[PDB]
Design a protein around this ligand. Structure first.
Ligand code: CL
Ligand code: CL
Lengths: 300, 287, 300, 287
């Protein structure tokens, strides 16, 4: 539990995941959170020096070969989350979409994420209750409904654990409606607010000041939103900046290129310069630590 | 209606040689399918490494089985799965075979490395006795269906030389192995002797950054190789790409510089076959 | 694939799970299907000589320490189903409740059950779309909605696989409404019909003749329904009789008794007569077959 | 806020002796909790047998971990889990410890049986060398938290006698085992010597239908035993009950005769604490 500085004992708290996340928010300006699809990606991000990582719901579906249409369940997300937290103590924020069902299912989701050593979740106000043959769409639940979802989650969560509420109201209802929802969500007990990228950076101050709690700005590619730098967002009062799919979009282009090279040429020579070396892989895996551990404890 | 194993065997017979590419997850298997591979591969080192673990036999049947199931749910392309040393004794090997068959897997490869039996044993690859690997093969063949393909891998060459390697491989065929998996031999002109002696189809392992050099599929085939495996090629490139995006975001405070190197939304939609979902709903519902 | 009779070769089909189930229906009068909560229970039932077994949705929840309120998902049910089918080829009927979501989730559920070597599922017409704070209740979806659920399932299922549709209309809508729904469900592509126990056995002929396809009667305890024998139900045209929780109710009383004995007495002597012997456990596990297998293949 | 391990240690210190009962699933753990046990147990043989498998080391970390997680999700009662021989080498043991800790497990027991290393090895229980078990313990203690409890089990008695058993057990304590798990000794008057030598708390295993006879908890305590385990007692009774219901239904065409032996809906509702769900919804919702 207790670390010390230099030679003499200072006070160190052994920190829950949620506490680590909140500290990462408070200590960064702003905290950049990067999407990672698997444990190996989280380790790459840790190595580069990110202080928080993210498990995207669309990433979970897409990596299973599925469209992001709400087909996946708590177990799909939970299993990918567990694999990442087994490999790193870097605070992990997990997408739980609409909570996967009613009050007790949201409760289960929260408790299971906490047991999986997750730091934070984000839950959104999209409609869940969809008729069997309903088309892919974005409708919002009523404000009261999302408050109930938040109430369900906060009822079971520990103090430290972070609930980040997301409203999808902006694209369809405009900035004023978005702020009203977000504020109701804070009143219901949301710890932080997750915001789609606003078209005008000078609207963030108004957003952030109204909601009070820390605001996350979602910087995805190939959407509608333009791309501001972390600095600019911070200067406008944003505390977290998320890069949800950036890494995996790039991985997919690379995999396809290798596959095409092998198929065209009957060999992967042309791909060699674009592969991580075995040596870099050994280093990210911290392979030496395994040798050193065996030598420390056993035969050496 | 084709069994997985039958699809794999047909891919072997009908390609010259059959190229088998590694895929770490279902999305990768779909990319490979899209490019037009006829068979795909789930690497044991890939399973471990993707979990943040070294390839030291820490992972078990469940780790590999879960990755296998996710791939086969997304594609009928025949999948060859690394089951390492079989994960335990005869009944564990039996469970591994039955579970891979239930997961719609087509083939496995099992190797003749020693199972790390001393608690604090150092990372190393020695061979089990020939008779031990025969037992492993016997365990697997006892429960497998006819169509399902067992590929036996001997690591004997590096430490025993070409003559001993052929002798092992042949004993493994006699025990019931369908096909033989060879570490890439120092010299392509070893393969003819190898391949002709063992009789059954031989797989050559074309990994990068190893000891083996890289021959073309044509050259391997001309030397009597029936399958060529590319176990980690795609995954190595994914990792470099991911790290570069992470460095870009960290250095520049934004991912602009990475944009040219990302798959577009439209290509992602196409690989996911997103339209087919819309089309399916339109076909069945709302009259 | 091919078995023979006596000495000479007769024609044998290697049968898919669904085909085994349909044959078990056709060959029994009626087919008794017993609930089993885990693989060891399925083996006990197989040993006694049942020809089909059942994985109850309430059983799955209750065994996890949860109420039967729709908290569990496809993975909870799927994992328990896989464990049972790994242990026995006896055709297994699995409760998938409302299908766990919309069209593609029902599709996933069907495909995953087929991959798990399941023979049949039953899906019911209870409302799924429930607001976050909705109370435990039984409302039916509209007939059209359940038809869509059936359409989703039949669209992906293999020929052999059996879809059994359940209407919960009876308790709240009466016999006439129940028959109307059931018939619409057959028209949508349901293979068989799953029926709560009717209060009067002489209503089954009307039920069974209207729906045409094989009818399963659900014989649970401690409900409203009275208990008819399998013979009587068959004589009234019922093809399957289900005993969903009977075994587990009895297991639970027994476990509690052992726990109380140990707690009261500081020892389990009084419980000994009510325990299965180690020898019977070895026999159900077919432990000898393991010894015989090792001796056949190896050192002997 | 109590760690699982701390709750377990307190249960040991505060009971005389602590009775630990086997539970195969979460519903059983809730039954045991309701009766008022202070600690519960997940048996490795129970894990296998419930999957339809013999207790021959076929199951892996995932089989046991999944059963453990389901129990701990339903109760905070400290759970002791059988991890057999640790499921592999040092890093597998490390993974087992870390994963049990993440699953909110309180304690494990690990035994000094040989890990079945030859493929076609016959069912048998021999001991590993003392040094091998020390390595196993070293691997586990290296990653475990302070509070988490490691119980070392020596099977030495049957084959080595009382003197050798004490010597092993003591070496295991020196290696870092928190507590010691003893197969029931032929004679209750062996325990005092055993317990006094090893120093740390000793668990006595009260299984049925074995070689061991059944002493009362009082008698064991008076001989210096700190914990008494009832590993399969409930499960054996469940199986007899299930089979009887199955035979009744099959013989009689109906389950009438079984009704008196079933838990009532009302008792099931109470163990599930069904009312608490209604009360929770009423507390939070609809104003
Ligand atoms: Cl490695
Ligand atoms: Cl056994």
């Amino acid at each position: 539990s207790g670390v010390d500085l230099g030679t003499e004992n200072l006070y160190f708290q052994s920190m829950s995941p949620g506490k680590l996340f909140r500290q990462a928010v408070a200590n960064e300006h702003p905290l950049q959170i990067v999407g990672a699809i698997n444990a190996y990606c989280a380790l790459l991000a840790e190595n580069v020096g990110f202080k928080a990582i993210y498990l995207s719901g669309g990433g979970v579906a897409n990596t299973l070969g599925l469209p992001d249409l709400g087909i996946t369940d708590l177990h799909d997300v939970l299993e990918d989350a567990r694999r990442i937290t087994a490999a790193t103590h870097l605070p992990l924020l997990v997408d739980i979409d609409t909570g996967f069902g009613g009050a007790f299912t949201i409760a289960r989701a929260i408790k299971e994420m906490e047991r999986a050593q997750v730091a934070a979740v984000h839950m959104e106000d999209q409609v869940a209750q969809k008729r069997c043959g309903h088309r892919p769409g974005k409708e919002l639940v009523n404000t009261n409904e999302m408050v109930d979802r938040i109430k369900a989650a906060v009822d079971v969560k520990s103090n430290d654990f972070v609930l980040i509420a997301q409203t999808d109201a902006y694209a369809v209802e405009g900035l004023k409606a978005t702020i009203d929802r977000a504020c109701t969500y804070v009143e219901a007990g949301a710890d932080m607010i997750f915001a789609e990228a606003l078209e005008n950076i000078n609207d963030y101050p108004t957003f952030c000041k109204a909601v009070k709690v820390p605001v996350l700005a979602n910087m995805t590619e190939f959407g509608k939103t333009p791309l501001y730098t972390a600095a600019q967002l911070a200067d406008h009062g944003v505390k977290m900046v998320l890069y949800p799919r950036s890494a995996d979009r790039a991985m997919s282009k690379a995999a396809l290129a290798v596959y095409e090279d092998i198929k065209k040429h009957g060999v992967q020579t042309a791909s060699l310069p674009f592969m991580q070396t075995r040596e870099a892989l050994y280093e990210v895996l911290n392979y030496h630590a395994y040798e050193d551990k065996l030598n420390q404890l056993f035969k050496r």
